[PDB]
């Protein structure tokens, strides 16, 4: 539950881990919702956001690739969350709203993930 046998663990643990610092990122208000939601680039009116990011995720599909066993090892997420965090921050550059919401998830999500990757590591 901190530091035992070797690091990759079942994606079950990580979520132990790793979920929690999800709850944190889904907890950040608003600022949370462009990701523990896909952007639906139809929904938000966004013809070409997957032109823009290569890798857009969201907490939904990082919660779930969670939910689902797609990590097997808590940095497999991180990369993932780092990577809804990075297309937001590239799409909408700087000076936006996700911008901020991504930029207090890090925040919180490295008050929780470091913890976790800690925990993990
Ligand atoms: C990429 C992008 C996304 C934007 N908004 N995204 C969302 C807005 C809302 S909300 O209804 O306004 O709260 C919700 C729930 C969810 C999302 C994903 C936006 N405004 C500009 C953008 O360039």
Not at 12 to 19: D, I
Not at 25 to 49: A, C, K, N, W
Not at 71 to 86: A, G, H, I, K, S
Request: charged fraction near 25%; charge should be neutral.
């Amino acid at each position: 539950g901190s530091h035992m046998r070797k690091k990759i663990f079942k994606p079950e643990e990580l979520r132990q881990a790793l979920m929690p610092t999800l709850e944190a990122l889904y907890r950040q208000d608003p600022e949370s919702l462009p990701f523990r939601q896909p952007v639906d680039p139809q929904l938000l009116g966004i013809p070409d956001y997957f032109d823009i990011v290569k890798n857009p995720m969201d907490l939904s599909t990082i919660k779930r690739k969670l939910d689902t066993g797609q990590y097997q090892e808590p940095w497999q997420y991180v990369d993932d969350v780092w990577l809804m965090f990075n297309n937001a921050w590239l799409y909408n550059r700087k000076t936006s709203r996700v911008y901020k919401f991504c930029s207090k998830l890090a925040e919180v999500f490295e008050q929780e993930i470091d913890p976790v990757m800690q925990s993990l590591g």
